[model samples]
Target: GSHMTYPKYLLSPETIEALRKPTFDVWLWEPNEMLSCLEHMYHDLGLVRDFSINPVTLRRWLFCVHDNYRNNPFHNFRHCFCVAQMMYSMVWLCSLQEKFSQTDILILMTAAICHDLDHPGYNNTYQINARTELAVRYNDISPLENHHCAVAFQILAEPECNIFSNIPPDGFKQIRQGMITLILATDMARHAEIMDSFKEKMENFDYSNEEHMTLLKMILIKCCDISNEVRPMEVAEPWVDCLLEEYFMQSDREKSEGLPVAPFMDRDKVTKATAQIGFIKFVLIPMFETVTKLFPMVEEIMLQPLWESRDRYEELKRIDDAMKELQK
Candidate 1:
């Protein structure tokens, strides 16, 4: 007998069939806010500008995000939609329209959608260190970021995904620039610098007055990328496990090829849950803490789950560490 495995970001036929039974309120039984948020973002971004960029394209994008392995583990399409949904939620939470302009809203949303399209998965550091194909293709500076940006532009060149076609050519150019800035900011190497600049500016706290939420939107996307750490146990645990499997798989590959395991992609060295807790404490907590402070209403609601998650992960890590210490 084979072990039953569940697919990520999908409902099985059995589950769907069960869900089909008449409900007291079918609308109330709709998928969670996250999926609805993503759908709206995709629609708003003109992801379906034409028939070519239609349902098929959306499905392909989804598959690439979650399952594709060419660059596997990290840059998959799931990360893209996840960030997009997070961006939407954060924007609403901030009441961005009250602070920002339509231009900013459109830019940030578009950035969230197009930022990681066609990403090759490897980080900018990998490209530089290994002198890989991506580095040579992009002339060595921030290769992964540059590649993702260029790919986004290339997609738009096609009439189908060129949803921005009606925009004045210059306006399109400017939007591309804005999107590139937000997308490249996802590189962990730039995390410290980006946060410093963002924190310093946000400390003074100026709403876009509904004119634009560009600043908030940009940081929100980055937050979404690292969101798993603070997610509830049900949601957080499975994703972390999947990600850890990815990490271990990558480590195995690197060792096989006699290459060093990249930072934070070592499951065997770090263990599954330990990596989640370590990152939650060192990276995620501070980020979310800052987020909660700025958005006070969400403080108790958001912080509690993540803080609890930290404790859960830490307990698991403690056990793993103890066993390792005993073995040693």
Candidate 2:
């Protein structure tokens, strides 16, 4: 394409206000609707003014990001904004400004926005077993995450798309490092490793320690990445549909090709409750409670939802089991 000028696209005051809340329904929006929401996120935090980011450049950056994300069932461009908006919501609910610097806030939002860029709808194990290009390129260590980092930089490499152009070299280096670290941490392979470190850090957490701050940022993005149950069930259950669609596609492909499938990905093995109950009870609750410890304000807003969703799913699973038994 030739030279392009960015036009201002504005959202309603009502829309802007709605975007600021945890209850904002991310499930309702098209990918296009999220650009203005993302813009509002930066303006709300004054990141555009504080970081001297050009509005036109920011729009271009967002457009490039959209172009790069494939039409995967779950990891598409809309999912990117879902994660970012959740991170934005938590920042406000937790009053993270009282705890983090503007730079840390910027890094958190940026990393979340770009965390799953260019995802191919297959997990890293599939890539390795298939000897896909990504696994071969990264040598099988978090290949998708590594590719996401590479693609994020590839977009930023464009002069018009480089939102961080105004940042100085030293500050830019730090931002790059933080963004890469946060994006890479999205890999599930390191879930327990990151979770345990975050737990230890939270016990004697000092916001000033560089390592502590880094670990906390990692945890924040992790929570946002898979935070579906935090929303109301109407807004949340569709994600179960989308994610299972993606996982089953992978499992089908794996079986067709004689590769192994994770039990959770196997369509025959995963009922809705079988898929969600354990994750909500074990993964989401514990991680969210750890974060809730740091922000007690979010208990009413967020933490309780994990419990509610788990119980709801447990009831469904019980009904499902009873139906099967009666048939027998």
Candidate 3:
């Protein structure tokens, strides 16, 4: 047995219990404590047992994944943890186990965990426009996601951290491809294509059709990726703050570096309410509704709060508008 040096922190029984539901507030835990939850998710989901992953090896792999995430204001390790936790909660909420294969479940969970590995705090446009190492390495095609997959696989290459060591080659190939597809789908540029594809399939969303299942899985991860609004405002609002800060950071960087900046990211042009309102109405609600069409249980818990979050943001925006009119 290889002697591993991962932290020994553990989640309280109460904490573990909270994580099984979507209402869990992830901001409450330290990263080390979150590791226990990560390990718990795999074991509780039966991934460790079904895949025959060595318990110690799983810890090493998680440590590697946790350590590799960069410390940006957003798109950091914490976001990835939130994404995976949301996915875990959604899987439970949606009763995916009965509808999907075990391997598909593994892909869903694992891909979410590795989805944003090594995010450089700069996005794809920055990568390509600046011709950064990653953009060149991946040739401007979902460069950041490509880099994430490469880094994830590199960690898995180490025998001590290779959780997939016991997986047969055929099975491993499918997972590898599955994870990459899901990872790449998180790029915002692909949003419309994914949404359109899923919308077309939602009418008669057939689980038996391999292609339809893949489309659904792709949209599912995208939903979880930007799922901060699904939580209560106390929990969800801070994430909006973090994202606004990150957007300004990137926009500022672009200004300094002479790269083209998008209007949404520009600090001068955006506010907390304005930024969130459109996303909730256009992107989040529509996609969540599409998925909810297949699983209506989410509408009460997920959509209601989502609609509420949008309303609250709109309320804030009107206050700003009224105050501006008074200033003039």
Candidate 4:
């Protein structure tokens, strides 16, 4: 295996120290901040010296992985880091470390980091509608996620970037399978099915069973992926803005290409507040509500922030509607 080239922006002592702080506001940092954060989590999570891969090799591999993320508006490296950060908090905040094994933790964090690799800045609808190469390749079933898993694994195939180089053959196989399962679970096409199945199984859930645990783990990562709404308003609002901008860009391209534009993605028909309210009520709230039901303790940590943000958006929507009514 060829040695990977180390990139500039190695973690500074200061940045590394800041990354150790549990509640660091990662959204405020520059785009490259994840370099240190991934390094910090590897050590902080106790995976540094104990694993088959050494710290230097792990860090080098992470740098290579980070470089692979495309600079898309919303599905880029920063959002990947955000999902990883939220996954960390959810693990600690919900006491998940005790329930999951070290291998499980590794898979969860790795899946978060690599889930959106090489995104093309377009939704599945766009891909399917336009019959893009990815859609054709994937048969219109989670083309983006399928591509992410493929590219991510391709990067890992590089000897320099293969973080699992030390695991035994069996363990390595498990990790690869787990990573693919978790990454594909993030596709929105499967969102309703995942949530519904989770809700159905919550009644008789068992933390000890490996299969049940995998289900919970899948749900946890999904929550982490869409968790921008459950963050503090200052933190969450910027994500909403970024996502809307991405959507509008896609909508613009759809129009120019003579394709059917996705509703609410068009800048003209949507306001941030209304789109947020719909998303919160329809998607974020129900999902997190189920998470809280299962964990029962992260209500304050996860669910309350969601409700608070929902209320804030509700208030803004009310004001907007009143003004519109007054104009008539």
Candidate 5:
């Protein structure tokens, strides 16, 4: 049965809320916390718009995705919250205001929430190779991320979800441009080089540099997007499970097509914990190290969580392996 057609009653509210957050980190918004975050964005920052309605529509849209389509594990709602909360933490601990304005924070928060709203669960490379419609539409470079931005805008274009409706057209324009830049930057293809360069810029960052404002905002979003690489174990482990679920689902599709399977995608071949450990060491940890070097405050708060998550994922992988072997 197509999950899209499933009745509302059958859906788990808790899990469905998880639908709004996207995994790719490219699409960060749609996490349930955006509701509260929106209010904060408004109250402290004076970003008054219709919050009463947007959250409901956001929740509905997210549930619709979970109900109708396939997605990567971390690409759902929980991952969005992870990024948002991490962004929120960075904003505070780093005393980001020294560089950013209240207006910039609003846009950043919005960008964080909508970073991966409607991801198709596949990575950019996979989509491009398959020559999917998205690739055709976007000409294959960061197509999914591009699509996420479009879809998020489309949803917001709806009068109900137009949380930005109240803001002046000029404000809308500012946020739109800033958000496009932030979301596009989350593509892993750009992840390493951008952060590395960011460190260099920050090292000699003359506060008077003309690009300082733009550069600071970009670095902040990147730091938040991958904050999982540095999150505490308790917070980071579930994210690993979510990510493994996504990878395993992809493996299932590959197996069905008789395609080469990515190891973590196959439960029979791999496990969540192993995937997390492998991903963290190969992808996440190193990425954080670069960010931490650039922004010591973020590193201080995030390193322990990341290490613990790696440990937990490793242990879980062992347990999963034992159970499978026993069954065999």
Candidate 6:
């Protein structure tokens, strides 16, 4: 098959170096930088050559994929970039490359990049409550995520952008299955199920079994999806704000449309510091604790930032409480 046209922009080697940095803030960079970073990740994994997609075609397909992401306040292309970057860090910090095959890394990065493709600025709760077409089509089971995978696959259907063209039939099928599974794992609706399954697996993890390894990869992608909690405060706090803004907008829409609003999404009922603390305590900390139980070294690289962020938010909440008491 013929390759696609070359992209207009090429990221500088310096910017690409920054992408590989463990603590770098990916959101600070532009889309071109993100594209460059993904290209770098693919090259680093040797996926371009393995998939038989030349550099020009890969860049073209990536740009096409990037353009498909809607300009939503939170679930935009930039968020995809952050997730991919976090996945990169997870692989590096945990030495996952040694544990997983090249195919696994390829699927992980692909899932990270396309997990939220074409998000419509509203969440699954809103879709289900409103009985939107997506909710009805997906039967209320991870509708948004299903849509994302569908859209991503649809983009790959075209000859010009199909990056998996060179893979054999069996390998392509495996790739598709892995990509879909990892994308669906990102849905918060599956969080409890996946967590319970992982908890059980953690009790007796056997790297030899292919099933156990697949579950581990799923957990890795989930952690990367919510990894903003473990990011440095300078990066994490702004992400919290952006997510809250998106949530509040959905809450306002729910109110206007006479649908029940989800907790923490309601603007009037939540404070940023308190919401962050609750997320840390109930969601992030436990997840990371389990993850670190499996990989001890991640405790410092991933869990430490989470603990620091929790403490910072707790202190802020206390200061806010004191100010309110003084006024009263």
Q: Where does model 1 exceed 4 Å of error?
A: 1-39, 42-71, 208-215, 325-328
Worst 10 residues of 6 by lDDT: 1-10
Candidate 2: segments with Cα more than 4 A from true spot: 1-9
Error of 2 at 9 (Å): 5.5
lDDT of 3 by residue, 1-328 (tens): 2255434475666677889888998898888888888999999999999999999999999999999999988898899999999999988999999988889999999999999999988889999999998889888899998888889899999999999999999999999999989999999999999899888887777889999999999999999999999998888989888898888999999999898999999999999999999999999999898888889999997999999999999999999999989999
Across residues 50-140, which tens digit of lDDT does each residue of candidate 2 receive? 8899999998899899999999999999888889999999898988888988888999999998999999999999999999999899999
- Clashing residue pairs for model 4: none
User: Mind giving the per-residue lDDT tens digits that candidate 4 earns over 1-328?
Assistant: 2256354356555555555333457676665567767777877787664566677777777788778887877888888888888888777777777888888888998999899998889999999999999999999999999999999889878887777888888988988889899999999889898887787778888888777777788898898898887776777777888898899999999999999997889988998898898888889888878888767877777777778888998999899999999999
TM-score of 6: 0.94
> lDDT tens string, model 1, 1-328?
2257754334444433333121111122223322433444555444445222455455444333333224456555555555555556555666655655555666676667666666654456555666789888888877776767777666666554455656676877777777787778777787787777777766676663321244555676678677654444665565666576666766666767677787577654666665767677777777777776667745564567678887876788789789989999
- Cα-based RMSD of the predictions, in order? 7.5, 4.3, 3.9, 4.9, 8.2, 4.3
User: All candidates' lDDT scores?
Assistant: 0.60, 0.89, 0.91, 0.82, 0.64, 0.86
State every prediction's TM-score relative to the real structure.
0.75, 0.96, 0.96, 0.92, 0.72, 0.94
Ranking by lDDT: 3, 2, 6, 4, 5, 1
What's the distance in Å from true for residue 232, model 5? 3.2
Query: lDDT score, residue 33, model 5?
Result: 39
Ten consecutive residues with minimal summed lDDT in candidate 1?
20-29
Using alpha carbons, what is the TM-score of model 1?
0.75
Error of 2 at 272 (Å): 1.4
By lDDT, who's the top model here?
A: 3
Lowest lDDT block of 10, candidate 3: 1-10
lDDT of 6 by residue, 1-328 (tens): 2245444346555556666645888666778867878888888777886777668778888999899999987788988888889888788778888888878888999999999999999999899999999999999988999999999999888878888888888998999999999999999888889999988888899988887877888898898888887877787778877888899999999999999988789888888898899889888889989989879988898888888999999999999999989999
Cα shift from native, residue 57, model 5 (Å):
10
Error of 2 at 108 (Å): 0.4
